[PDB]
Amino acid sequence: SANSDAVTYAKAANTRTAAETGDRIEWVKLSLAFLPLATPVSDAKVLTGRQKPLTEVAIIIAEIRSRDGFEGVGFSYSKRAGGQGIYAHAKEIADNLLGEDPNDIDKIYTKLLWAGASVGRSGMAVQAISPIDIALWDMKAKRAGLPLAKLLGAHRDSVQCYNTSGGFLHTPLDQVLKNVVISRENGIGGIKLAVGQPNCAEDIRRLTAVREALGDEFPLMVDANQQWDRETAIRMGRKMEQFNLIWIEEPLDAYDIEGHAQLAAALDTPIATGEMLTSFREHEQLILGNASDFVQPDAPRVGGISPFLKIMDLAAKHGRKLAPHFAMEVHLHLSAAYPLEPWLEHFEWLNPLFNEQLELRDGRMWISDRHGLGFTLSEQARRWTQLTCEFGKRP
Amino acid sequence: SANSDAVTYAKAANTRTAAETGDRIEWVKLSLAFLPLATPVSDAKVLTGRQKPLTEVAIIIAEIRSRDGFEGVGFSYSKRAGGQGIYAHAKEIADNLLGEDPNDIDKIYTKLLWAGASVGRSGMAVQAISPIDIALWDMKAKRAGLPLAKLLGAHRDSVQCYNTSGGFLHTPLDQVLKNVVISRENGIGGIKLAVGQPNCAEDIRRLTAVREALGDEFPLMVDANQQWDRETAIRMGRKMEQFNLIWIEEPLDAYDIEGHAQLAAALDTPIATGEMLTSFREHEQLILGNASDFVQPDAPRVGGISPFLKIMDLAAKHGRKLAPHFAMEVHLHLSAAYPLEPWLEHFEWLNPLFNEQLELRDGRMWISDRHGLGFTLSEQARRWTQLTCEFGKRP
Numbered sequence: 116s117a118n119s120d121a122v123t124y125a126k127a128a129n130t131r132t133a134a135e136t137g138d139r140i141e142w143v144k145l146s147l148a149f150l151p152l153a154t155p156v157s158d159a160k161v162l163t164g165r166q167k168p169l170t171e172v173a174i175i176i177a178e179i180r181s182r183d184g185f186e187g188v189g190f191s192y193s194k195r196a197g198g199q200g201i202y203a204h205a206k207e208i209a210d211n212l213l214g215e216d217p218n219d220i221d222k223i224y225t226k227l228l229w230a231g232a233s234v235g236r237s238g239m240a241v242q243a244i245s246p247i248d249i250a251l252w253d254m255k256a257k258r259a260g261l262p263l264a265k266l267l268g269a270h271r272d273s274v275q276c277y278n279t280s281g282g283f284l285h286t287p288l289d290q291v292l293k294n295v296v297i298s299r300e301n302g303i304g305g306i307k308l309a310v311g312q313p314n315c316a317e318d319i320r321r322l323t324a325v326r327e328a329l330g331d332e333f334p335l336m337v338d339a340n341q342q343w344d345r346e347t348a349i350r351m352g353r354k355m356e357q358f359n360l361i362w363i364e365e366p367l368d369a370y371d372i373e374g375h376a377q378l379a380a381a382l383d384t385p386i387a388t389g390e391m392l393t394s395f396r397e398h399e400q401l402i403l404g405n406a407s408d409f410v411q412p413d414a415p416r417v418g419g420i421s422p423f424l425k426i427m428d429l430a431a432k433h434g435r436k437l438a439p440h441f442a443m444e445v446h447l448h449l450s451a452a453y454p455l456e457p458w459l460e461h462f463e464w465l466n467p468l469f470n471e472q473l474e475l476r477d478g479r480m481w482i483s484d485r486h487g488l489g490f491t492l493s494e495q496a497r498r499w500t501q502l503t504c505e506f507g508k509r510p
Numbered sequence: 511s512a513n514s515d516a517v518t519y520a521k522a523a524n525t526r527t528a529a530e531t532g533d534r535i536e537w538v539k540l541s542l543a544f545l546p547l548a549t550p551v552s553d554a555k556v557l558t559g560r561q562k563p564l565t566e567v568a569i570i571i572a573e574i575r576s577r578d579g580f581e582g583v584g585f586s587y588s589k590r591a592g593g594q595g596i597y598a599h600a601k602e603i604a605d606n607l608l609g610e611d612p613n614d615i616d617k618i619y620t621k622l623l624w625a626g627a628s629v630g631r632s633g634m635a636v637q638a639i640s641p642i643d644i645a646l647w648d649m650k651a652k653r654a655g656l657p658l659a660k661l662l663g664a665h666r667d668s669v670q671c672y673n674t675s676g677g678f679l680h681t682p683l684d685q686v687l688k689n690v691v692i693s694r695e696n697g698i699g700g701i702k703l704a705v706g707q708p709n710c711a712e713d714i715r716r717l718t719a720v721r722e723a724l725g726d727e728f729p730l731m732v733d734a735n736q737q738w739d740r741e742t743a744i745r746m747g748r749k750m751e752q753f754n755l756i757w758i759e760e761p762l763d764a765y766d767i768e769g770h771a772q773l774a775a776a777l778d779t780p781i782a783t784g785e786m787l788t789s790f791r792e793h794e795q796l797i798l799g800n801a802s803d804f805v806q807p808d809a810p811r812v813g814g815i816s817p818f819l820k821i822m823d824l825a826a827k828h829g830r831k832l833a834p835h836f837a838m839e840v841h842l843h844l845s846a847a848y849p850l851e852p853w854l855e856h857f858e859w860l861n862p863l864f865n866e867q868l869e870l871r872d873g874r875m876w877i878s879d880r881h882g883l884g885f886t887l888s889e890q891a892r893r894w895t896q897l898t899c900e901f902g903k904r905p
């Protein structure tokens with residue numbers, strides 16, 4: 116009998132609790148490095164005078180070591196001003212990590228938010244938490260002896276990949292075409308052309324020239340970087356229907372929800388946006404407002420893997436596709452865990468930071484058998500480091 | 511420099527892929543057992559004539575072993591008819607598990623759903639997937655060398671606990687009071703009284719008597735098991751405002767969303783419901799309808815841990831508290847991962863199925879250091895097995 120007239124309580128032997136036997140964070144190292152770009156990069160934002168050419172990328176790295184011998188590495192970044200503040204805030208809160216059980220990632224995330232309650236739950240502050248949140252996930256995966264994608268649960272072992280770095284606006288049409296062949300010869304699965312420059316006639320020129328070389332089937336997409344007004348948007352979009360694009364990215368201001376929704380409803384061509392958003396809440400607004408067919412969150416920018424997962428689930432409920440922005444070293448795993456077939460964006464920019472490189476085969480990026488994110492920092496990463504600080508003591 | 515006038519591509523050395531190195535399921539064992547209840551249990555569902563007293567509990571157990579030596583165990587249950595069906599379906603689809611990477615839990619779930627597409631994505635079919643889904647989560651946690659709660663990431667190391675098995679309707683008042691003392695003496699953190707019997711006057715008598723015995727502060731709650739109609743629910747609700755209960759559980763039919771919402775808005779006392787729901791979508795309709803203050807999902811009933819996690823995220827997003835129903839062996843880990851302070855429900859019924867017992871101290875149930883769920887099947891569980899089948903070959 117499993118019961119009786121009166122209630123009965125059992126007795127346990129192993130009185131050891133998970134609280135007293137868990138691992139503990141003992142050391143943390145933060146670094147602010149700068150990825151130099153010999154060739155200044157220009158997208159529509161530069162062509163319209165909104166910003167100056169990009170000449171480098173700030174990278175904020177977090178390395179965490181546990182008492183039991185596990186290590187996690189993660190990073191956040193900034194294109195243009197932001198790296199100094201992200202590093203500074205991370206440095207002012209990292210101390211809170213010492214002594215915590217590295218497995219309670221969200222409990223830690225919460226403690227970090229409370230420590231910086233005055234500066235919000237979105238934007239820079241959470242971007243200061245991203246490298247730490249990502250390092251903790253990296254650690255958990257390693258603890259389990261699995262690539263991050265497998266710790267989360269994968270739906271695919273590889274992800275379609277397209278290249279962006281070779282289609283910017285500071286690049287003459289002839290070079291863009293030269294980059295296309297190089298990219299295809301290397302097994303890229305798609306090409307994204309940066310558009311949205313004052314001269315609309317030119318973007319059409321450059322765009323028609325690319326579609327010609329690639330043929331009719333090769334996945335092609337465009338990105339206006341928020342440089343069109345509603346009128347131009349629908350106009351250009353309606354005209355671009357003759358390219359069967361995978362998507363039209365950021366046709367309008369990142370916060371113009373109704374404008375994007377309107378565009379998405381008026382065109383068969385999918386609309387993509389969200390890379391500039393810096394929190395789950397911001398992405399939720401775009402999603403509830405049916406702003407786009409493709410959601411493009413950025414783990415470092417939204418606060419790390421933890422918030423990114425929430426964004427993924429929400430997008431999934433609304434049947435939206437996923438096309439993460441930048442940092443493929445982290446997004447490869449996240450997009451591998453997405454229910455619907457995603458797209459991965461490719462840049463070579465971060466390659467020199469790591470000792471390993473991802474495998475690009477037949478239009479797809481394959482997940483290696485390496486644990487966690489599957490990357491180790493290179494000598495170059497240390498050379499490019501300008502500021503660093505440590506907490507605790509190496510176990 | 512990290513970039514150039516053209517586009518650059520590196521090359522990967524470590525050519526091994528996660529696809530070719532992942533673990534693989536090689537053996538699966540399913541069992542249908544019956545937990546005997548020598549003392550027939552009856553709540554309001556019996557006193558109103560809807561059902562007959564409960565005399566046993568069906569238990570569907572799944573055991574999975576991987577090529578690399580990992581093992582996982584999980585289960586679902588059925589109070590009254592349903593167990594033969596759950597077992598029958600699990601047996602008809604289990605074979606699909608062989609050769610699958612056990613870490614891709616959602617991927618496997620989807621494959622199992624397609625294997626039985628004809629029978630839906632809710633109800634019995636997912637309750638047949640439950641044992642398997644739970645076993646896989648149990649396996650992943652063990653692979654990481656962590657209690658399930660830590661694999662998920664805990665917000666607490668113990669959870670407030672209340673007893674239910676001592677306050678049922680087939681139990682005379684004085685016996686209930688006796689169980690209360692016994693329960694309180696064993697360190698219980700709360701008491702739930704079964705109400706909703708035809709004689710409303712008699713429940714008030716029992717409720718008053720219990721509140722008197724427990725004192726003013728001790729956590730007390732009631733459960734009507736869907737036996738009131740809207741008129742009675744509100745009437746009993748006003749009348750109970752005085753006892754300052756932690757919550758009023760299932761005052762109406764489990765699918766009367768507007769009814770619950772109306773009671774929730776009308777009363778200060780929290781309203782709880784959800785134990786009868788059998789899928790994420792079902793719970794989602796109640797949550798989007800603002801039906802209750804406390805959401806009470808049942809992992810075995812909703813399809814396992816995977817869907818239970820989505821229910822948690824949805825509930826959290828709407829600021830609702832969590833109070834999982836039954837199966838404390840699994841819910842301890844899930845509730846520990848909930849961001850808002852949850853409640854765990856205690857029954858002794860399943861204690862004999864496992865060799866290990868949970869530690870109850872100071873009104874809370876503590877998570878032990880044992881990995882995965884932290885339970886191994888006892889011999890008594892084998893004694894109570896009526897049917898069983900196996901697939902593959904034990905590695």
Ligand SMILES: O=C(O)[C@@H](O)[C@H](O)[C@@H](O)[C@@H](O)C(=O)O
Binds near residue numbers: 169
């Ligand atoms: O989708 C992308 O990768 C681009 O949208 C880049 O974020 C680009 O703006 C950036 O590299 C820049 O040039 O400012």
Ligand SMILES: O=C(O)[C@@H](O)[C@H](O)[C@@H](O)[C@@H](O)C(=O)O
Binds near residue numbers: 552564589735785855
């Ligand atoms: O919340 C509870 O514990 C109850 O709601 C039980 O599920 C009860 O109905 C069941 O044990 C029964 O007697 O039918």
Ligand SMILES: [Mg+2]
Binds near residue numbers: 338340364365390
């Ligand atoms: Mg872009």
Ligand SMILES: [Mg+2]
Binds near residue numbers: 733759
């Ligand atoms: Mg109940």
